[PDB]
Design a protein around this ligand. Structure first.
Ligand code: BZ1
Ligand code: BZ1
Ligand code: ZN
Ligand code: ZN
Lengths: 250, 250
């Protein structure tokens, strides 16, 4: 299976979003477009208790042929946010493009951002995915620097590597900016699209420099022969269906 | 009013703990001695959501004649921990002595520590005071360094000063070590001893170097003439009464 951009090569052809295996065609798919003016408030949506996010250590990364995967291996844990149980951090990856206005899978009021980050948590419901919007800024983001530096070494798919001493916490916006977010039931945005995901999309975006952003498409490749750089690894908007989207603030 | 150590001077005499004004003689006073084997578990005692603890800024400090006060001025906020409402950080101070085994007001199983830190929060119940035990170690604590350096400048009572760029978070133990704590209703440990305090005492202590610890008694003074260094600003154990002490873990 692959994204639209990958089917463009006349030579060889795979299952683009249009033909992704069963379950991707179901009643409750992600991503969606959040219409703020139509979201219901739920007081219980109190900020997450972030455990293990302040720990500094080396992170094993790899190009999985679809994105840059960073293994968190249960080092972190999250509690609260009206979640049924406790979830642990498993992996972290991103979705991007070549512009600063159409690289995020989700969108808030018809607005797509530069990139979108996904921190996946397995139930210790089933998956609790925290999604952050990223926006290109005129200033460098020290928190993201460690991740950018390891990019040149994992160019081709399946390459393993490691990220220098860093902590998840420094990659997110301040704790005082994590009050406002959106909740809704959905699915994985890639096959097989298991509808066992509880989504939390935050309003405040993370700003990274234009040069840090360009490093992704420049160093990462989808193929072994390094003919197609990695970008546009984004799935198109899915119909809201009958689902209801909530927000933490009133 | 003053502590025992201050009444020792034959010249002049004030109200030692023995004669502290009304309310200090009531049915539910703090500190107490936590008997772990007799504490009741309460699942609701889930870890606090620490807001504004990750912010780095200059902190105004002053010797208030009873301890080293550090104004947090509502910069931080705490939510959860089965608290009735949200509380904001107002001030931070400490209680110590000259040894490493009898400077903490509270005690866990007949054991007193080197120092005890108190981060006071006003109700945005009434006061939510987080108490941390401090222990002398063989390694320096970078998180506490900023506070130690400002000590020499606030020797005499009522001296104002400022602490260099630092954050509350780096002064506490890791987030993964803040799972176990104790809850109980009590009062201020100094006059007038208002019984409007919800206490949270954490099990894991903060370790600081023996030299960092000695700086407190060496630089701080109770009096204008700097004849009596500051130490033993600790109130003696108060009877548990009929109160019940809970713990977050089972
Ligand atoms: C990118 C790799 N494709 C899947 C892989 N995994 C699904 C296997 C079930 O668990 C064994 S995953 O749980 O790590 C996960 S989360 C997302 S998303 N984009 O955050 O909606 C996609 C995916
Ligand atoms: C040390 C100064 N003595 C009081 C001052 N204040 C009580 C005035 C009521 O509010 C206006 S206080 O709330 O900042 C507070 S908390 C404690 S303790 N040791 O943490 O139990 C003592 C005190
Ligand atoms: Zn994703
Ligand atoms: Zn105190």
């Amino acid at each position: 299976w692959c994204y639209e951009i990958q089917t463009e090569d006349p030579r060889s052809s795979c299952l683009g979003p249009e033909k992704w295996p069963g379950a991707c065609k179901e009643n409750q798919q992600s991503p969606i477009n959040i219409v703020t003016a139509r979201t219901k408030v739920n007081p219980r949506l109190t900020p997450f208790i972030l455990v293990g996010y302040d720990q500094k250590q080396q992170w094993p990364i790899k190009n999985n042929q679809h994105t840059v995967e960073m293994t968190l291996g249960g080092g972190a844990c999250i509690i609260g946010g009206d979640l049924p149980a406790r979830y642990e951090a498993v992996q972290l990856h991103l979705h991007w493009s070549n512009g600063n206005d159409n690289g995020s899978e989700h969108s808030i009021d018809g607005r797509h951002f530069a990139m979108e980050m996904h921190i996946v948590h397995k139930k210790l419901d089933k998956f609790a995915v925290l999604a952050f919007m990223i926006e290109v800024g005129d200033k460098v983001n020290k928190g993201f620097q460690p991740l950018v530096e390891a990019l040149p070494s994992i160019s081709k798919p399946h390459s393993t590597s490691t990220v220098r001493e860093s902590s998840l916490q420094d990659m997110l916006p301040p704790s005082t900016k994590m009050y406002t977010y959106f909740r809704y039931n959905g699915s994985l945005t890639t096959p097989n699209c298991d509808e066992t995901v509880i989504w939390t999309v935050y309003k405040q975006p993370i700003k990274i420099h234009k040069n840090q952003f360009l490093e992704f498409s420049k160093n990462l490749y989808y193929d072994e022969d390094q003919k197609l750089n990695m970008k546009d690894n984004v799935r198109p908007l899915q119909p809201l269906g009958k689902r209801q989207v909530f927000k933490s603030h009133a």
